[PDB]
Amino acid sequence: ELITENMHMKLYMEGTVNNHHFKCTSEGEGKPYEGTQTMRIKVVEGGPLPFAFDILATSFSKTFINHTQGIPDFFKQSFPEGFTWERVTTYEDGGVLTATQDTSLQDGCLIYNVKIRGVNFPSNGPVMQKKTLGWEASTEMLYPADGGLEGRSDMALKLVGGGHLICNLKTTYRSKKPAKNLKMPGVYYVDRRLERIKEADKETYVEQHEVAVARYCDLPSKL
Numbered sequence: 001e002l003i004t005e006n007m008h009m010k011l012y013m014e015g016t017v018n019n020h021h022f023k024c025t026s027e028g029e030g031k032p033y034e035g036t037q038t039m040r041i042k043v044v045e046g047g048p049l050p051f052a053f054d055i056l057a058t059s060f061s062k063t064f065i066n067h068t069q070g071i072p073d074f075f076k077q078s079f080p081e082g083f084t085w086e087r088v089t090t091y092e093d094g095g096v097l098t099a100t101q102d103t104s105l106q107d108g109c110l111i112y113n114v115k116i117r118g119v120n121f122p123s124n125g126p127v128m129q130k131k132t133l134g135w136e137a138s139t140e141m142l143y144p145a146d147g148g149l150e151g152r153s154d155m156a157l158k159l160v161g162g163g164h165l166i167c168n169l170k171t172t173y174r175s176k177k178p179a180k181n182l183k184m185p186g187v188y189y190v191d192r193r194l195e196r197i198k199e200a201d202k203e204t205y206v207e208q209h210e211v212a213v214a215r216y217c218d219l220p221s222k223l
Helices: 053-059
Strands: 007-017 020-031 036-045 083-091 096-106 109-119 132-135 138-145 148-159 164-175 188-200 205-215
Touching (some): 138 164
Parallel strands (some): 007 109
Antiparallel strands (some): 138 188
């Protein structure tokens, strides 16, 4: 009941990447049970950013994942209190983007607050040279650990000229609701696409869409 068929989102983000300070705000809507969502994002301080906006894409929403097969949904269960996430994204060319997030709910609106710290992005690498072209589809594996959920994913960033730069995501999701009141899932997987829909003014405005579906392994087992 707290999480309905159609929901809105509002976000505030601040941080630094290679010592460059910035702030973003965003507004969006989606369908939490269908796993679809759109964010319209503005860089409101420190624009235009000296790095590829793509490295911020995963920091803009776990309530909008279609949890199929009765998978207990840690995120939707966490309301009204909400949940937090803390992530480290490690790029294979050295860049490290750490992000911490709070998810709350007010007036049927999801409210996100994000803090970003990015360090060691190579100055001649595609992030700092802005030679990136968005993300391939990815799979996250989630599993219970110490009363929260851990997630892990490798993602591939498309590059001008056709190659890819890969990064690995390690995430800790923690509920603000007490353990008493939560049914934990076992190991499961979330497949997703994160797509750039529009950009304006050298990525000071960005529209991004995600579709995400959770599943167990659907393959036959001999055990």
